[PDB]
Amino acid sequence: RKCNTDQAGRPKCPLDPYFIMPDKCKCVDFQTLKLQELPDAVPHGEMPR
Amino acid sequence: LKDYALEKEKVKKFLQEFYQFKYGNQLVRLAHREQVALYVDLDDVAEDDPELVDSICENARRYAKLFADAVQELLPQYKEREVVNKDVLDVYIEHRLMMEQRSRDPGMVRSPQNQYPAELMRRFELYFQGPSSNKPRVIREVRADSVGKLVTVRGIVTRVSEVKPKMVVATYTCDQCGAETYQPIQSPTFMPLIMCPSQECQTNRSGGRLYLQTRGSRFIKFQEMKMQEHSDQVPVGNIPRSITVLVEGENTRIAQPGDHVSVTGIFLPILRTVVQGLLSETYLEAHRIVKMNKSEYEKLAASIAPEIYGHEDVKKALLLLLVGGVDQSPRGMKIRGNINICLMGDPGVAKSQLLSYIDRLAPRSQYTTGRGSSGVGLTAAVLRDSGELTLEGGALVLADQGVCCIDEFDKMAEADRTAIHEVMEQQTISIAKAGILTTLNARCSILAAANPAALLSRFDLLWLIQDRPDRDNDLRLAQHITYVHQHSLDMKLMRRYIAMCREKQPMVPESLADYITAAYVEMRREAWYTSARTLLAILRLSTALARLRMVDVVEKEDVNEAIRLMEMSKD
Amino acid sequence: TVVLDDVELREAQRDYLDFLDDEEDQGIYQSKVRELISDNQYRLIVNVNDLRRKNEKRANRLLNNAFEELVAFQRALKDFVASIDATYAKQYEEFYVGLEGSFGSKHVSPRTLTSCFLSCVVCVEGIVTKCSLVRPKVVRSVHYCPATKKTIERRYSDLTTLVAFPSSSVYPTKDEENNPLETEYGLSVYKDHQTITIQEMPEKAPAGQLPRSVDVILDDDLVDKAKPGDRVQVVGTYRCLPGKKGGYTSGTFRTVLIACNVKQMSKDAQPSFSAEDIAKIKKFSKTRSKDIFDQLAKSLAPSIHGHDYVKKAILCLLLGGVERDLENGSHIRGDINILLIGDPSVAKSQLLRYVLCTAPRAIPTTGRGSSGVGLTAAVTTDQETGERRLEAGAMVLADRGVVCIDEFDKMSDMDRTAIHEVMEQGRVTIAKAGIHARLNARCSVLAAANPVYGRYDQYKTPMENIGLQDSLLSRFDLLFIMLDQMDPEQDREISDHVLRMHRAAFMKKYIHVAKIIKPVLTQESATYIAEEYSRLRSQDSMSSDTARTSPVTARTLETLIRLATAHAKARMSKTVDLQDAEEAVELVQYAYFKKV
Amino acid sequence: TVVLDDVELREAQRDYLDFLDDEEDQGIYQSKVRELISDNQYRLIVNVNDLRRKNEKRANRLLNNAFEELVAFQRALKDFVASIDATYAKQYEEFYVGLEGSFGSKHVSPRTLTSCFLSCVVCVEGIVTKCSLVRPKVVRSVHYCPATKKTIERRYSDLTTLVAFPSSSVYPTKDEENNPLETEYGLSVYKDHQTITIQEMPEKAPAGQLPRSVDVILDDDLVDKAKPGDRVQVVGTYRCLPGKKGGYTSGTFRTVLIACNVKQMSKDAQPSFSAEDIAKIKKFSKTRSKDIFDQLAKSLAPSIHGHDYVKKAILCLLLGGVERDLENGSHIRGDINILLIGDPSVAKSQLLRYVLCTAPRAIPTTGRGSSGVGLTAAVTTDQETGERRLEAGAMVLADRGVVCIDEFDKMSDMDRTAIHEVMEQGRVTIAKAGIHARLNARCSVLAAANPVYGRYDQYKTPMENIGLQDSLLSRFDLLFIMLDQMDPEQDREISDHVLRMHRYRAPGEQDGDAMQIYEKHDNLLAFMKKYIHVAKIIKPVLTQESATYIAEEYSRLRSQDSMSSDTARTSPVTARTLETLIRLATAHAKARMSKTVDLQDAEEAVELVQYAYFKKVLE
DNA sequence: AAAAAAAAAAAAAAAAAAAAATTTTTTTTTTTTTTTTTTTTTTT
DNA sequence: AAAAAAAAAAAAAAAAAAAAAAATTTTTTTTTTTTTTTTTTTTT
Ligand SMILES: Nc1ncnc2c1ncn2[C@@H]1O[C@H](COP(=O)(O)OP(=O)(O)O)[C@@H](O)[C@H]1O
Ligand SMILES: Nc1ncnc2c1ncn2[C@@H]1O[C@H](COP(=O)(O)OP(=O)(O)O)[C@@H](O)[C@H]1O
Ligand SMILES: Nc1ncnc2c1ncn2[C@@H]1O[C@H](COP(=O)(O)OP(=O)(O)O)[C@@H](O)[C@H]1O
Ligand SMILES: [Mg+2]
């Protein structure tokens, strides 16, 4: 929320000063799967969880 | 600009190879830790490479870092034995590198900020001494343009703080892990730390809570000294400019208040923190300290101020004091070997000039006229400094061992007169004043001058100069001084002979006991003001004359010349 | 953003480049730019009167708008010196201007300076009162990454009186990937920075009024231009300082004066040299040499009648002897000191004020006007940094000059005991606990005293008529007696001359060059002075009813040498001849012998 | 915060200045610089194998960390092109560096563009999916204050990939005195900007899986180099994007591929020549110009036997006639169209696959695979602007190209009539209420129908035996009838040929595991593409003799007596047949590189039609 | 010897400066669903 | 061959996800200016 320098100048850094540096982020692969209950596992009248 | 890896390679090969291995012997001595400081010489480096020397002159601090790390890496191959670990600091560094070896895992890579730093683990220090080509510049003239530049200055000292331990690398230990983190200090202040970046802490997610202590730290001998322009350097009407100088390591405790100094260093800045910009203080970081130009028989006495004529016995007694009577502390009660002279005179015989020459001469000297130094000027007083009521000294305590050339003693303030009586009688100065409760130690010797009883009764010699107008005397003196204006021993050699002469320590013989007692009683009858003080006067003058002869035994010639001098003075 | 077009800025730089060219019209600024180039200086000085003469509307724009027009001026100077020279303009990165001349409504004092002159170029009179320790402000900061081996250089700008945000004044301490830097102090650039406090000049302020003061800011090649107690005249820009980041402003804008030029009193006018001056002084030196001193002393102070010998001695003090310094470190002073003393209404104070008006670095003082610490130096406490500090007294300010003491007899004895230092050495050994010093106060002393009993007793010896001791009269090289001789022809001529005066520059030029001149003395003169002083040092020199005035000494011989050398300086011969020696003999004889 | 020097950047720029310095070598990159300066193009394409061989380490460094490395490359390029010509190098504020070569590990597909390849120049083949409007982006914006007679130039940095600040993104509108600023659009500077979406090819992609696609931001220099449906190989910098400001972030970083260059993955625009090859073609033409058509015809489609007339006709198609657009836009087509009708197992589909593999911009259309709206173009709304866009069909894609119609008989009458205006005029005039247009598809059609009853009955007439209207058979200009005679003698012929081709192997390259003008005359048995490609351009005008002869032969064909009884026509002789005669004559002359169609080509054309059309139905 | 001027040190008060600081709501986008038209396909 | 029925396509409308957008002074500190008091040094 607040820059931590104590040396930004005679004035201070504004409120919420940080912008994410996109290039300097090291990232990974991720995947949102939609797993559905096993059809033989589902009880008779219910619906697949 | 250049590449500082190349520069470091250059200076490494240089330090290994230049000359008897001139730098090699120094390197091996510090490797064994037979010296703690080192000194580069830009004359010795201009012996081969001038570009590197000019670069050092223009950006000296960086090359200081280069040289010191280069010697740090040259260290261990020069090391040849096991040093005895003379300090608990030695114990710490040895233990530190031992555990680094223990948990080394040499293939394993460690971060750019996980390592014992040089400024901590060096245990030696490296300074410089600027080249003869580098003219010492005026303290006023060392402006912003000369910030970072290598610069030598010549100035008088005004006041010097004591040796208090500046922090160099603070060491912190943790409450859970047990590692030891460093905060390398640079500036006048540091905010302490409270959290430990040790990787065990980063793995545990524990509260750091590290506690600073002095044990594992690295302090250093630090002084802030002041310096003042030379009165000859000063321009036509301005007061002399001052300067602050910072003294580190084996540069500490060289200069002392009142002694002329030549300091070689770099003019680096500190943060000032009301106009915008980024302002900054200026301190000169000393890197070589050399006192200079004041504190580095018949023909000799005539060499004492050749520009004055006559007063040959006066000059001989002045030479005698400058040698100094033998310092004695027998059976507790002190019989000090100081010689106190007063010159009462008709108006104008160059007595002030004699005092000024003695001021220029003696290794410690303070020439004080009537009221320029009064009260605290002669005594010692209190001043704000680490801010504190630092008690520092005036003229006499500055001249604690030397010669106070007091001019116009007749018209001094009565408190000044009382203090001078105290110092001539007991070489102390007791004070119980408003904010001072002390007994200063002032082992000074007094050269009073004045114009025409207590003076006679508290001294070793009083000399009345009455220039009774004698035509031939004045003719010869007139020819002499006119020749002086017409044409306009060396001082260093004179002072060298005196300096060696100070330390022969004669002891009086038994053969002269009858002679001295007989001469004492005979002088008393010839008087009938003389007393035990005059006995001590003849006796001190005898000891000092033996010193001038350099023999360790006083003889009849010495006492004869002493009585000659005193007879001439009284008459 | 970057400006592509600006009618104001473009025409400003065009007009400036045109004005500063000046080669086709009398070469004033061509000569000045060539001079600062050769002398290696980069702050030009510009006559605003000439600027008004050439382009008056530009002048009004400059005065009524300071920062914009000055930025345009300094950049035009940059381009102009770039044209005349390449490597020099590359070496020096920004070329300042300072302003000078007559500033009609804007030539003010710190009292009359209201807010009407904000952002404008004022010319403020008045003394200096404060002088801050000179400090470097960082302007181009170089850093080196130890890990990356790359060097960067952050820059800054003179945001002294403009809007300033934290981004401009950040100073690097970390690399873009958290690899802490090492600053390269030597490779960086710096600008010294000082702040003085002008005050309205103490006489010119209306009486019974607490004085008005204005702060002044100084930068490169202006810091050590004026110490405290300087009768300065600062030309500069009057502006407002922004109270830093607010959220509530009272609207009270503090103000400063960013100095674009600094000058002292014009009297110290050593450079006033020209073809006519050298021609006329060479004529004076060559066509006549046997009566230079006589003619010059005669025309010295034309208002006061007579005093031929005393005025000759005044000229001896004014020219001075020659300071003879020795290889051993001894120093035999070259400056004469004089004590006028005489009956009331013998123009003693008028001779003093004459010296005060004419000579360079001439300081008045009256008997109990200055008491000790005023006359010699003093040692005060800073009271902010705790240290001591030296305050230069009148004598110290008068170093290499003159001090004129009026009512010297009524001056307290303590002051004379204080000046026992200066009257032979020229040095004051002031000292207190935290600071010892030895201040060059090498300056002549002219003094005026009335005798004891109010008026000189004609029928008593001078030792009884003077309330001063042998010591003090010996410290004074010269003592002079003046008595109102009431003879008829004397009263006729003195009153006639006084009424006549009731109904120079070449001298000012002559005095300082003669002071520069350093003659040397001959062996003929040497033998002559030796035997003359030997003649004097004898009871046979004096006689009954003609008592001496001062205790004759080796000081008397030495000051005879100084007198002879002074007469040589008058003659420009560089050779103290028997003429000078004889003249000094006559002078010392008349000054030292008086009848009873 | 200007950097004084960086060893990395200085080293890289020196290395690439050396790489561009090509005089001691053959001069390849110097020649590339000189030609691009002459072209006014401002991108230079550097082969990664060249970079790797000259300095493998720099190739590794660049293919691992692109943007700053290519900044070094482009600064070196600017310095180099300034040394060649400072005046031109001053012209453009930047010059750019395209890539090419064997991106060995750096060749993946959008299914396999994992999060390992960030800031690495990845190579990726795929099909476009979208084509966003190519709209300007402001780079250097100039303003004018009329109150103060002032001008300003705000400057913008292309931080499409890095962190971007509002102070950088300000567009000024008022001065310090709150005056009004008027933008100077012309004096400002802009660069085009387009987004597209590459997709994993369905021929390459996994069979049962959803598509996967990657976003590609084409700035200037690459505006219209990729439309939807095209095959394109994109090489460029996969990176991350900055989320707009806000105190919160989820970790999500929607990623793009800022393409460094994009090339046509079809690899069928291939005129790659050398001067020696040009001379080879020239001699091949001129030495034996009169027999060259038969040389080409016998040559074309090896690995098949006989059908020499059909090979001649497919040559007439591929070489093409000559389109004619007269004074008022009466556009008379210049394409051949062939209908193979014949028994099964007559290599008709093999001829189709041959022309698919050889002819540039050839595309297959099945009977009920493609259908109408797929075949010709379509009109559909956007749904992001409610505006009617046009979706180019198979034929429109095949404009100035070939379409191979498998099982033409099975296209229903709706599509068989939808092909009419493309067959004749080579255009599709489509329209719905919002938008209308005349998409241009100057296509050529080789169509392999199969006979009614599943096999030709010899005694039945061709019109009875073909299930196709005389209406369409007019529009087709040649109909070739391919019967399986079933005689043992020609069976021996075809069989020996076929089994020889079953015995032919990759020469030397294989061991036993399964997967120049003239040819080295392998007993068991490229320049075709080169020569036919150059042949297409020539416009050999008809001579007076050829025009009179072709006219009279057409009149003879129209007259019923020219066909004897017991023969049955296969296609009625409308005037389309005369235009067929002219087009086939032009195609033969183009084979000869004649520059004039002569009586030789005319009589070859008349021979072609006489064999093709009139069939001998037997009793 | 007493008076007084100056010095340093200590304290009060007014002006300027320093510092502290996430949550709720709205809008684009994507994705399906539904209606109705158009198209295609099967029947007599 | 044309009519009837069904299937698919095109286009408009709705529901949720997740990234964007907007609002937003007051109290404490502390330096500096001013005054005051006790003392020492100096003068009458
Ligand atoms: N023999 C000599 N050599 C040098 N200077 C001399 C000599 N005799 C007299 N003087 C002069 O006498 C002057 C007065 O001397 P000074 O030191 O003031 O004596 P005091 O101060 O005791 O009266 C000096 O300026 C000095 O030059
Ligand atoms: N020799 C003289 N010639 C002309 N005026 C004189 C002379 N002596 C004294 N005066 C006059 O006396 C007046 C005051 O004299 P002043 O300098 O005050 O002497 P003092 O200091 O003894 O009072 C002046 O106006 C001055 O002109
Ligand atoms: N003229 C021919 N020459 C050589 N082989 C042929 C010929 N016609 C047919 N064949 C063989 O018969 C097979 C028929 O395949 P294909 O062409 O796909 O079916 P169709 O001929 O019915 O279109 C081919 O694989 C080919 O090997
Ligand atoms: Mg003396």
Ligand SMILES: [Mg+2]
């Ligand atoms: Mg008077």
Ligand SMILES: [Zn+2]
């Ligand atoms: Zn820890």
